[PDB]
Symmetry: C3
């Protein structure tokens, strides 16, 4: 599983420990063991949301399964909550794209997961 | 809706106002209200297009609907035109990937 | 075809020829002429893989065709081999997402394919 956050919040506002927090909370919310979980945060980006350059984030969560209607609602509350508390980004200036990956289309260590 | 541009053009070649321009043009071209449009530009990238390091761009347009055959053609003309006039990138060195997102797979404001 | 690598390896550890090597190897592996292949490498990223900040990569390969079960297994070998030799990333710390793109959903040169 992979979680990516792109944000115009400066690097200095990302707390020490944020990646660890994300890895642990995602493991807890999805049930995936943390060992299979990757996390990627990209600060200081040039972006706009609704024409405004106030703090925002564009994110993506890729997973083989564990994606659907109810789950994604629950992840969006979790992740917007984390972005608001830790990076001070308003939840209405966050988008998160969810991707249910086919195991045949995910490579890892010289093979795929199919 | 979100539009992302990754390019090897340096930051100083991105005009002031380019993100506002993109937002307004995408609203006009797609009919989405501008308040739902997010834009993201990433300059100074390490990339190659066809083995060459001359100016290029790799882009993505994600939208809940408003994606399809004719529409994507029309967006590619708009967007390549913008990248050419504004960033001086040749249209034959631009790729744009279009994604029709399911509303159930887009989170926003604590929900989907 | 486009291939993107995001990694926490610093920019100075990415060999200057890496982008061209990727282009050429992908052309050979997929049969796409190299003039159609774009490559993008993003170093110095803030990332973790399994909670650990040791070298890792998150990658994507997008292509109109040339994507499927067997092909993707083959590309993962090719690309883990390259990342291991050139960026010294362990292959068990690489994810690659593969995307078979509809030609209608790829723009290029003012139109789509």
């Amino acid at each position: 599983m992979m979680f990516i956050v792109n944000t115009n919040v400066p690097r200095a506002s990302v707390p020490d420990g944020f990646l660890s927090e994300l890895t642990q909370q995602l493991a807890q919310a999805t049930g995936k063991p943390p060992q299979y979980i990757a996390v990627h945060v990209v600060p200081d980006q040039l972006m706009a949301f609704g024409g405004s350059s106030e703090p925002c984030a564009l994110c993506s969560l890729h997973s083989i399964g564990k994606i659907g209607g109810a789950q994604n609602r629950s992840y969006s509350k979790l992740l917007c909550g984390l972005l608001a508390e830790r990076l001070r980004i308003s939840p209405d200036r966050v988008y998160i794209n969810y991707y249910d990956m086919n195991a045949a289309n995910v490579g890892w260590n010289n093979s795929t997961f199919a």
